[PDB]
């Protein structure tokens, strides 16, 4: 089976998408994961967007695990340079029927008081105690304490292109981040066996968070917009 | 609501119980959680016994959480005093349809690669890197790194009586361990809010494991028998 879908731009009322929390689709065809009021991003926000149908990542019957490729472009604009923007966005795969986890440095996917399995790639903008120098991309398996990290220099307000490919044969998850206006290229990879971590069917989508009010700094925010998104996966057996 | 059950001793073919892995009920009416062949407890063992029907620990419509009490007697016999007996047993509450996680110091409940929520009381006999002096009673919330612990001196081969009470009105989980032959009393308590951790309906039961072959020490074993077990829960709403 080969599932595929492509969004060159999002539209309002889109059937194949499931918005959660603050996430909404603007008139301009941009998916804003977090809250922006008349051009200014707000703190204390969290939002997610999921493809409305689950995809089969592997089969128990055959033991085969699906390969997949996903591509998307995003934009993170940081208006208040000081004291520190927050928190970041992530592409994630998690079991179906899940609710938004905690925000902040958890991105709306990780809840320490009610854990569930998840694999996710993060573009992190705030340096928590469990984090290395920001910004950095990170591969996360069940936790926000990344297995692998690589720092990057954000194109503030610019466009970022991302390619994430998973090869069943090698169990390699490889991630590409490009900032076209800047010419910069960032690469990061790790072995992840989707079978020992996730159930047969999952949900794919994005999650983002802006500073938590418990920080007392309202200038800890930024936008987390998605411009386009396509996904393809193949399960032989 | 008020579910209630009691086992003075276990009878083979017990319909209200649900054994998993190595766990089994012997002729003498004892429920042996881990493997013992002709009186000799063997390493590399993991077993679980769960009550057949799921209990409702809380209500979303009303917001009411249940109070419960459970009492049981166990026996841990350590035939090989050296190099070190292992690993222990636990009473635990987890989401329905759970699967026997990792053995060893994870007691057949925790599974790092595929987390799920659980609340448990362990009686730990092996000192892992995350553990303090053994043996000790410990309260576990979603992980084997206890929130609160207390040490105890085991009556090797003897009978232990345990009382576990949860008061919804205060979220106090209180634990009592008595070794009758010795006259010793160990007590431990912590604040635990079942609503922030578990779903409305869970499964209640026991789990135990003997040393893992990864330690390369066949002597890291002991018995983990359950003599009797009563349980009462009351959900006002
Ligand atoms: C932050 O947002 C959450 C959910 O939208 C709300 O509970 C909270 O009161 C909001 N405001 C502040 C200042 O915390
Ligand atoms: C230990 O026991 C398990 C389950 O019975 C088995 O699969 C494994 O190969 C055993 N290994 C050793 C060294 O005993
Ligand atoms: C294993 O236990 C037996 C019984 O006490 C003992 O004779 C043997 O040499 C022990 N092995 C170690 C490493 O202590
Ligand atoms: C926050 O952002 C505004 C807008 O840039 C700036 O004038 C202010 O002093 C910044 N610093 C803090 C600590 O809020
Ligand atoms: Ca962070
Ligand atoms: Ca231990
Ligand atoms: Mn991070
Ligand atoms: Mn312990």
Swiss-Prot record, chains A, B:
Q: Which UniProt keywords apply?
A: Glycoprotein, Lectin
InterPro entries, alphabetized: ConA-like_dom_sf, L-lectin, Lectin_legB_Mn/Ca_BS, Legume_lectin_dom, Leguminous_Lectin
Coiled-coil residue spans:
none
Question: GO molecular function of the protein, one example?
Answer: carbohydrate binding
Q: Which residues are glycosylated?
A: 44, 219
The similarity annotation says: Belongs to the leguminous lectin family.
Protein task: Lectin.
Q: What is this protein called?
A: Basic agglutinin
Source species of the chain:
Psophocarpus tetragonolobus (Winged bean)
Gene symbol? WBAI
